[PDB]
Design an enzyme around this catalytic site. Structure first.
Site, PDB file in Angstrom:
ATOM      1  N   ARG A   1       0.506 -18.950  -4.608  1.00 60.62           N
ATOM      2  CA  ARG A   1       0.687 -17.572  -4.600  1.00 60.62           C
ATOM      3  C   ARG A   1      -0.527 -17.046  -4.005  1.00 60.62           C
ATOM      4  NH1 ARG A   1      -2.309 -12.864  -6.312  1.00 60.62           N
ATOM      5  NH2 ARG A   1      -0.807 -11.076  -6.586  1.00 60.62           N
TER       6      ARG A   1
ATOM      7  N   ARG B   1      -0.990  -6.034 -19.950  1.00 56.90           N
ATOM      8  CA  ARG B   1      -1.360  -7.268 -20.326  1.00 56.90           C
ATOM      9  C   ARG B   1      -1.726  -7.813 -21.691  1.00 56.90           C
ATOM     10  NH1 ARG B   1      -5.487  -7.485 -15.085  1.00 56.90           N
ATOM     11  NH2 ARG B   1      -3.917  -6.681 -13.504  1.00 56.90           N
TER      12      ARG B   1
ATOM     13  N   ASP C   1      -3.310 -14.435  -2.853  1.00 54.91           N
ATOM     14  CA  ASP C   1      -3.620 -12.967  -3.325  1.00 54.91           C
ATOM     15  C   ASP C   1      -4.268 -12.316  -2.049  1.00 54.91           C
ATOM     16  OD1 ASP C   1      -4.147 -11.285  -5.676  1.00 54.91           O
ATOM     17  OD2 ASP C   1      -6.195 -11.537  -5.189  1.00 54.91           O
TER      18      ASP C   1
ATOM     19  N   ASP D   1      -2.494  -1.660 -16.143  1.00 48.21           N
ATOM     20  CA  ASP D   1      -3.371  -2.379 -16.554  1.00 48.21           C
ATOM     21  C   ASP D   1      -4.564  -1.753 -17.011  1.00 48.21           C
ATOM     22  OD1 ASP D   1      -5.484  -4.317 -16.619  1.00 48.21           O
ATOM     23  OD2 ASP D   1      -6.018  -4.017 -14.632  1.00 48.21           O
TER      24      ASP D   1
ATOM     25  N   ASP E   1       0.278  -6.141 -12.087  1.00 43.56           N
ATOM     26  CA  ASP E   1      -0.018  -5.088 -11.374  1.00 43.56           C
ATOM     27  C   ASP E   1       0.705  -3.886 -11.373  1.00 43.56           C
ATOM     28  OD1 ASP E   1      -2.554  -6.229 -10.211  1.00 43.56           O
ATOM     29  OD2 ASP E   1      -1.470  -6.947  -8.515  1.00 43.56           O
TER      30      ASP E   1
ATOM     31  N   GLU F   1       1.267 -12.356  -1.375  1.00 47.71           N
ATOM     32  CA  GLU F   1       1.134 -11.160  -1.974  1.00 47.71           C
ATOM     33  C   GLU F   1       1.321 -10.097  -0.822  1.00 47.71           C
ATOM     34  OE1 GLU F   1      -2.222  -9.693  -4.411  1.00 47.71           O
ATOM     35  OE2 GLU F   1      -1.142  -8.133  -5.216  1.00 47.71           O
TER      36      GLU F   1
HETATM   37  O1  LIG Z   1      -6.473  -5.368  -0.628  1.00 45.34           O
HETATM   38  C1  LIG Z   1      -5.297  -5.563  -0.394  1.00 45.34           C
HETATM   39  C2  LIG Z   1      -4.639  -4.418   0.112  1.00 45.34           C
HETATM   40  O2  LIG Z   1      -4.809  -4.108   1.448  1.00 45.34           O
HETATM   41  C3  LIG Z   1      -4.327  -2.766   2.079  1.00 45.34           C
HETATM   42  O3  LIG Z   1      -5.060  -1.708   1.437  1.00 45.34           O
HETATM   43  C4  LIG Z   1      -5.970  -0.999   2.361  1.00 45.34           C
HETATM   44  C5  LIG Z   1      -5.171   0.589   2.436  1.00 45.34           C
HETATM   45  O4  LIG Z   1      -3.889   0.607   3.060  1.00 45.34           O
HETATM   46  C6  LIG Z   1      -6.370   1.609   2.775  1.00 45.34           C
HETATM   47  O5  LIG Z   1      -6.008   2.665   2.968  1.00 45.34           O
HETATM   48  C7  LIG Z   1      -7.577   1.271   2.319  1.00 45.34           C
HETATM   49  O6  LIG Z   1      -7.279   1.740   0.734  1.00 45.34           O
HETATM   50  C8  LIG Z   1      -8.766   2.424   0.451  1.00 45.34           C
HETATM   51  C9  LIG Z   1      -8.326   3.886  -0.069  1.00 45.34           C
HETATM   52  O7  LIG Z   1      -7.824   4.632   0.764  1.00 45.34           O
HETATM   53  C10 LIG Z   1      -9.238   4.545  -0.774  1.00 45.34           C
HETATM   54  O8  LIG Z   1      -8.894   5.749  -1.487  1.00 45.34           O
HETATM   55  C11 LIG Z   1     -10.155   3.423  -1.769  1.00 45.34           C
HETATM   56  O9  LIG Z   1      -9.169   3.517  -2.860  1.00 45.34           O
HETATM   57  C12 LIG Z   1      -9.607   3.854  -4.311  1.00 45.34           C
HETATM   58  C13 LIG Z   1      -8.474   4.775  -5.026  1.00 45.34           C
HETATM   59  O10 LIG Z   1      -8.045   6.038  -4.060  1.00 45.34           O
HETATM   60  C14 LIG Z   1      -9.130   5.200  -6.277  1.00 45.34           C
HETATM   61  O11 LIG Z   1      -8.009   5.908  -6.799  1.00 45.34           O
HETATM   62  C15 LIG Z   1      -9.461   3.844  -7.141  1.00 45.34           C
HETATM   63  O12 LIG Z   1      -8.343   3.191  -7.103  1.00 45.34           O
HETATM   64  C16 LIG Z   1      -8.079   2.189  -8.345  1.00 45.34           C
HETATM   65  C17 LIG Z   1      -6.791   2.798  -9.094  1.00 45.34           C
HETATM   66  O13 LIG Z   1      -6.608   3.859  -9.453  1.00 45.34           O
HETATM   67  C18 LIG Z   1      -6.456   1.622 -10.203  1.00 45.34           C
HETATM   68  O14 LIG Z   1      -5.105   1.742 -10.639  1.00 45.34           O
HETATM   69  C19 LIG Z   1      -6.680   0.157  -9.545  1.00 45.34           C
HETATM   70  O15 LIG Z   1      -5.913  -0.146  -8.455  1.00 45.34           O
HETATM   71  C20 LIG Z   1      -4.986  -1.193  -8.918  1.00 45.34           C
HETATM   72  C21 LIG Z   1      -3.492  -0.791  -8.137  1.00 45.34           C
HETATM   73  O16 LIG Z   1      -2.919   0.171  -8.991  1.00 45.34           O
HETATM   74  C22 LIG Z   1      -2.417  -2.175  -8.032  1.00 45.34           C
HETATM   75  O17 LIG Z   1      -1.371  -1.693  -7.523  1.00 45.34           O
HETATM   76  C23 LIG Z   1      -3.291  -3.405  -7.300  1.00 45.34           C
HETATM   77  O18 LIG Z   1      -3.311  -3.153  -6.057  1.00 45.34           O
HETATM   78  C24 LIG Z   1      -2.670  -3.442  -5.275  1.00 45.34           C
HETATM   79  C25 LIG Z   1      -2.024  -2.462  -4.171  1.00 45.34           C
HETATM   80  O19 LIG Z   1      -1.243  -1.738  -4.970  1.00 45.34           O
HETATM   81  C26 LIG Z   1      -1.166  -3.291  -3.040  1.00 45.34           C
HETATM   82  O20 LIG Z   1      -0.830  -2.217  -2.148  1.00 45.34           O
HETATM   83  C27 LIG Z   1      -2.105  -4.284  -2.365  1.00 45.34           C
HETATM   84  O21 LIG Z   1      -2.954  -3.613  -1.607  1.00 45.34           O
HETATM   85  C28 LIG Z   1      -3.172  -4.081  -0.371  1.00 45.34           C
HETATM   86  C29 LIG Z   1      -2.337  -2.905   0.351  1.00 45.34           C
HETATM   87  O22 LIG Z   1      -1.185  -3.101   0.206  1.00 45.34           O
HETATM   88  C30 LIG Z   1      -2.719  -2.773   1.914  1.00 45.34           C
HETATM   89  O23 LIG Z   1      -2.273  -1.765   2.442  1.00 45.34           O
HETATM   90  O24 LIG Z   1      -2.661  -5.231  -3.226  1.00 45.34           O
HETATM   91  C31 LIG Z   1      -3.408  -4.627  -4.174  1.00 45.34           C
HETATM   92  C32 LIG Z   1      -3.751  -5.817  -5.150  1.00 45.34           C
HETATM   93  O25 LIG Z   1      -2.736  -6.359  -5.984  1.00 45.34           O
HETATM   94  O26 LIG Z   1      -4.460  -3.634  -8.318  1.00 45.34           O
HETATM   95  C33 LIG Z   1      -5.361  -2.592  -8.306  1.00 45.34           C
HETATM   96  C34 LIG Z   1      -6.791  -2.996  -8.836  1.00 45.34           C
HETATM   97  O27 LIG Z   1      -6.515  -3.336 -10.402  1.00 45.34           O
HETATM   98  O28 LIG Z   1      -7.945   0.146  -9.354  1.00 45.34           O
HETATM   99  C35 LIG Z   1      -8.302   0.851  -7.911  1.00 45.34           C
HETATM  100  C36 LIG Z   1      -9.782   0.534  -7.825  1.00 45.34           C
HETATM  101  O29 LIG Z   1     -10.646   0.533  -8.932  1.00 45.34           O
HETATM  102  O30 LIG Z   1     -10.571   3.063  -6.544  1.00 45.34           O
HETATM  103  C37 LIG Z   1      -9.967   2.725  -5.247  1.00 45.34           C
HETATM  104  C38 LIG Z   1     -11.256   1.631  -4.605  1.00 45.34           C
HETATM  105  O31 LIG Z   1     -12.412   2.783  -4.339  1.00 45.34           O
HETATM  106  O32 LIG Z   1     -10.403   2.534  -1.130  1.00 45.34           O
HETATM  107  C39 LIG Z   1      -9.590   1.724  -0.579  1.00 45.34           C
HETATM  108  C40 LIG Z   1      -9.976   0.448  -0.058  1.00 45.34           C
HETATM  109  O33 LIG Z   1     -10.754   0.723   1.192  1.00 45.34           O
HETATM  110  O34 LIG Z   1      -8.173  -0.120   2.467  1.00 45.34           O
HETATM  111  C41 LIG Z   1      -7.100  -1.024   1.860  1.00 45.34           C
HETATM  112  C42 LIG Z   1      -7.626  -2.483   1.755  1.00 45.34           C
HETATM  113  O35 LIG Z   1      -7.372  -3.280   2.908  1.00 45.34           O
END
Ligand SMILES: OC[C@H]1O[C@@H]2O[C@H]3[C@H](O)[C@@H](O)[C@@H](O[C@H]4[C@H](O)[C@@H](O)[C@@H](O[C@H]5[C@H](O)[C@@H](O)[C@@H](O[C@H]6[C@H](O)[C@@H](O)[C@@H](O[C@H]7[C@H](O)[C@@H](O)[C@@H](O[C@H]8[C@H](O)[C@@H](O)[C@@H](O[C@H]1[C@H](O)[C@H]2O)O[C@@H]8CO)O[C@@H]7CO)O[C@@H]6CO)O[C@@H]5CO)O[C@@H]4CO)O[C@@H]3CO
Length: 474
Positions: A199, A362, A201, A358, A314, A231
């Site tokens: 799987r 978990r 990541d 999360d 997630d 994923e």
């Molecule tokens: O890495 C794989 C990822 O690739 C693509 O995503 C890109 C995206 O499209 C771009 O927009 C950009 O994203 C940046 C974003 O715009 C910025 O704002 C910042 O993000 C910050 C958040 O805004 C801020 O709120 C905080 O977020 C924290 C969350 O609150 C917390 O819940 C947790 O997040 C977890 C998610 O909830 C959970 O779903 C899981 O994440 C998955 C994504 O949801 C899923 O879409 C995918 O991601 C892809 C995406 O689809 C593509 O489009 O897989 C993920 C992993 O399974 O896990 C998360 C962690 O537990 O934590 C966060 C962080 O603490 O902080 C963030 C960070 O500053 O930055 C973003 C990155 O630059 O870029 C991404 C990357 O390619």
């Protein structure tokens, strides 16, 4: 082959069952109590020895495959911060634990796939530690994307490329031969060790198209029956042309089922806090249109191997997503076993564990039967056995028959599935649109109800609120 219609069960290693001896280096300190609230850094001590011990439980449920979150040495309780790709984490019991698990699993016809985190490593990985101690003089410098020195690895502004900018996850430089060789040897090694698949990541963090094609050839080369799933949370045509993954985690299907079955009772605020996003409510027809798109935009062999989950490590847990609605959670889970693809269940959802995002999702697995929502578990056990005895459910096409409100009916070859995702009863008398040509006696495989259609209309009794039916000409 085996991964096209199989019932998958996802286990978060540190939270399934604690048993057996740890590996070396053995931990020397107390473990977070099992029934205590999950934390960001806490370890409960679940092991792979314990997973092997709980196999009879999984066999009873009908599990055909186990999808494990990362099991290699890591400093994180979730283990996505890899320290050594060649050693199963000590706390989980080391390589011998994984070996034993595979033996018992396989001896009972159960496959086991691992989680591959190849985009980045933890700060504890050898090459990264080498960078930290030696700076520019380190012969491992090109394993990462170093911006400058010092690395500032413990500040919110790391001096190197990192997953989502988090300093705890240094991004690997896959184009470097030494790196690609290491990762490809990893992918291969575990498949030869006995593992049945991978799987992947966030595979999109490694845009290089030649890596995944090489990855596939190395894995399939070591075991042609190996399953490779990636994923991707949205559309994934690029990764499913046949030269990369066999399937992906069907989060889009999860959003659809949740919106349709969840109805207005869905906790969109909870779901919006994760990758699920704010799930839009859906009526029968709109829901069916989503399935028709999901079931047709990829080759048929890919659609049948899709990892159809509703929740995961997630996402918020199902029961919390339905505001405590056991009947809704039961219908959403039930429906998964009636669609093409691999129905996948996150550990604990079958017994009704609850939790927000999360680490709330978990928690330690509850093994006290008297505490399980027996209704949810019996439905999973019941529908898993139904799917197992009626192979058409995993191979046949999807054809909509009736759609209105929260009432849906679709056919899967010789079967007619009828879903009543609403608070009110649903009389099953809609037009069959040719589903049962023979036009004779029919039976609801789920309730045992029997009847003979006439006038081209179904003839069953009312379908109770949030209930399912599966007819076949008797
Ligand atoms: O890495 C794989 C990822 O690739 C693509 O995503 C890109 C995206 O499209 C771009 O927009 C950009 O994203 C940046 C974003 O715009 C910025 O704002 C910042 O993000 C910050 C958040 O805004 C801020 O709120 C905080 O977020 C924290 C969350 O609150 C917390 O819940 C947790 O997040 C977890 C998610 O909830 C959970 O779903 C899981 O994440 C998955 C994504 O949801 C899923 O879409 C995918 O991601 C892809 C995406 O689809 C593509 O489009 O897989 C993920 C992993 O399974 O896990 C998360 C962690 O537990 O934590 C966060 C962080 O603490 O902080 C963030 C960070 O500053 O930055 C973003 C990155 O630059 O870029 C991404 C990357 O390619």
């Amino acid at each position: 082959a085996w991964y096209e219609g199989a019932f998958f069960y996802q286990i978060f290693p540190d939270r399934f069952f604690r048993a057996g001896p740890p590996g070396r280096p053995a931990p020397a300190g107390p473990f977070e109590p099992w029934e205590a609230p999950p934390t960001l850094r806490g370890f409960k001590g679940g092991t792979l020895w314990g997973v092997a011990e709980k196999l009879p439980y999984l066999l009873d449920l009908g599990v055909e495959a186990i999808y494990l979150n990362p099991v290699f040495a890591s400093t994180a309780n979730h283990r996505y911060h890899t320290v050594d790709y060649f050693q199963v984490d000590p706390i989980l019991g080391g390589n011998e634990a994984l070996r034993h698990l595979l033996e018992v699993a396989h001896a009972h016809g159960v496959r086991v796939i691992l989680d591959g985190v190849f985009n980045h490593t933890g700060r504890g990985f050898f090459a990264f530690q080498h960078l930290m101690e030696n700076g520019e003089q380190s012969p491992y410098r090109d394993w990462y994307h170093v911006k400058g020195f010092p690395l500032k690895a413990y500040t919110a502004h790391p001096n190197y490329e990192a997953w989502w900018g988090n300093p705890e996850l240094p991004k690997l430089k896959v184009e470097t031969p030494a790196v690609r060789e290491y990762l490809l040897a990893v992918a291969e090694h575990w498949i030869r060790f006995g593992v049945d698949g991978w799987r992947l990541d966030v595979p999109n963090e490694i845009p290089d198209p030649t890596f995944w094609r090489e990855f596939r050839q190395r894995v399939k080369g070591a075991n042609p029956e190996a399953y490779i799933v990636g994923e991707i949370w949205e559309e994934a045509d690029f990764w499913l042309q046949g030269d990369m993954f066999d399937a992906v985690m069907n989060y889009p299907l999860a959003r659809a089922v949740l919106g349709f079955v969840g109805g207005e009772a869905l906790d969109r605020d909870l779901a919006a806090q994760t990758g699920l996003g704010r799930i839009e409510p859906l009526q029968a027809l709109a829901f069916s249109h989503r399935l028709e798109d999901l079931f047709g935009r990829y080759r048929p062999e890919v659609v049948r191997a899709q990892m159809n989950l509703l929740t995961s490590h997630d996402t918020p847990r199902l029961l919390s997503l339905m505001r405590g609605s056991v009947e809704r959670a039961r219908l959403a889970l039930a429906l998964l076993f009636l669609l093409p693809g691999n129905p996948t269940v996150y550990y604990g959802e079958e017994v009704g564990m609850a939790g927000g995002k999360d680490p709330e999702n978990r928690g330690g697995m509850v093994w006290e039967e008297a505490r399980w929502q027996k209704d949810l578990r019996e439905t999973v056990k019941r529908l898993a056995r139904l799917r197992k005895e009626h192979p058409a459910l995993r191979t046949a096409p999807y054809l909509r028959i009736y759609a209105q409100d929260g009432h849906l009916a679709f056919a899967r070859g010789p079967y007619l599935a009828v879903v009543n995702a609403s608070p009110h009863p649903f009389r099953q008398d809609f037009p069959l649109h040719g589903v049962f040509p023979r036009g004779g006696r029919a039976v609801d495989l789920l309730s045992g109800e029997v009847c003979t259609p006439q006038g081209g209309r179904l003839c069953g009794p009312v379908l109770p609120p949030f209930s399912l039916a599966l007819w076949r000409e008797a």
